[PDB]
Design a binder for these strands. Structure first.
Ligand SMILES: Nc1nc2c(ncn2[C@H]2C[C@H](O)[C@@H](COP(=O)(O)OP(=O)(O)C(Cl)(Cl)P(=O)(O)O)O2)c(=O)[nH]1
Ligand SMILES: [Cl-]
Ligand SMILES: [Cl-]
Ligand SMILES: [Mg+2]
Length: 326
DNA sequence: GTCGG
DNA sequence: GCTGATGCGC
DNA sequence: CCGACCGCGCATCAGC
């Protein structure tokens, strides 16, 4: 919050490029600049001071001087006044509605929450659930509640098969005092990169959590990735908790470390780290880290026995989860 | 929009 | 039906 | 300059 004004402005600009302009690289440039600045231990005094940081260039420098001078940015001022842009940005806030669908909805005269509700027929499954819990998904999750959720998930999974290992990742594993949702990494000895000895490994867990009424809805579901909704049980007479977004990712047991690295994030941390790996001649995904051949083709997976091993391969000093929040 | 070669 | 591209999300 | 910008699972569609 030291440079909150500036980072907020950059994020708004990032969201505009992504949602309205559909310019992903500009979106990421703004996000990176915001990220690099939010980590800066000094209260920025000029765009010049900011341009010193990698990720901030001439354009963002100028915008920072304007913001520092007036306390706002005219470019954004005009974007907020723009109806089409305003409507498109709003609609993308519904899970399942992206830049394309939002712009398409606006063309059809569907621009508001009221319009969406009276046009459910025009939404796919994911979008319907997104609209259903629109308000709830905007809410933050206190770490206290994350702990209760963790307890339920780990205990329910244990009941299905004592061999399952569920790990809560995302901002929770990074030590955040609140999270936007729950991310669960799941492993089972029967599912490795070498073979899938038992089917429905993910399904069984999903089924068990729906059975005890923890999982309430599904946005999408496959062999290794579940994307849905959950809710903590409330006591008698007490208002019920808000519904929460939950993702469960089944990863090969022998590829746990690359999996937990990926799922722990942050997303920008992953991007920076993956980009650095490339520069160092390696490629990283949630399954492995492989070297890049002379022509640029990925090679065979390298042995990994801890998250640190991955960091060493790319010549990075180990960074604890709590320090990966970029 | 920013960056490295 | 399958394969490939695209949207969307993590 | 100028092109590279992380990598991938699921849902949906187009074309066959
Ligand atoms: N490589 C890669 N990994 C990603 C990406 N997006 C997400 N991940 C990985 C890294 C992410 O940590 C993880 C979970 O996705 P979230 O739940 O979206 O991210 P959280 O960090 O949990 C959070 Cl702070 Cl947005 P919140 O607490 O509010 O949920 O997935 C991406 O674009 N790329
Ligand atoms: Cl772009
Ligand atoms: Cl792989
Ligand atoms: Mg999360």
């Amino acid at each position: 919050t030291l440079n909150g004004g500036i980072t907020d402005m950059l994020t708004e600009l990032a969201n505009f490029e992504k949602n309205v302009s559909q310019a992903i690289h500009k979106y990421n440039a703004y996000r990176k600049a915001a990220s690099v600045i939010a980590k800066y231990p000094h209260k920025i005094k000029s765009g010049a001071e900011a341009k010193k940081l990698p990720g901030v260039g001439t354009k963002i420098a100028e915008k920072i001087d304007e913001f520092l001078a007036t306390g706002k940015l005219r470019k954004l001022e005009k974007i907020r006044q723009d109806d089409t842009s305003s409507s498109i940005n709003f609609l993308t806030r519904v899970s399942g509605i992206g830049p394309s669908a939002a712009r398409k909805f606006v063309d059809e005269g569907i621009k508001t929450l009221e319009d969406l509700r009276k046009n459910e027929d025009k939404l796919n499954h994911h979008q319907r659930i997104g609209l259903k819990y629109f308000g709830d998904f905007e809410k933050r999750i206190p770490r206290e509640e994350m702990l209760q959720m963790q307890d339920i998930v780990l205990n329910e999974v244990k009941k299905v098969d004592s061999e399952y290992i569920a790990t809560v990742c995302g901002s929770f594993r990074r030590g955040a005092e609140s999270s936007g949702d729950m991310d669960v990494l799941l492993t089972h000895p029967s599912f490795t990169s070498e073979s899938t000895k038992q089917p429905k490994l993910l399904h069984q867990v999903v089924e068990q959590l729906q059975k005890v009424h923890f999982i309430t809805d599904t946005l999408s579901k496959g062999e290794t990735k579940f994307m849905g909704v959950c809710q903590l049980p409330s006591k008698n007479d007490e208002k019920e908790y808000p519904h929460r977004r939950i993702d469960i990712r089944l990863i090969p047991k022998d590829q746990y470390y690359c999996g937990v690295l990926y799922f722990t994030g942050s997303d920008i941390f992953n991007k920076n780290m993956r980009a650095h790996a490339l520069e160092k001649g390696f490629t990283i995904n949630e399954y492995t880290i492989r070297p890049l051949g002379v022509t640029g083709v990925a090679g065979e997976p390298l042995p990994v026995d801890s998250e640190k091993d991955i960091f060493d391969y790319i010549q990075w000093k180990y960074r604890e989860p709590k320090d990966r929040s970029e």
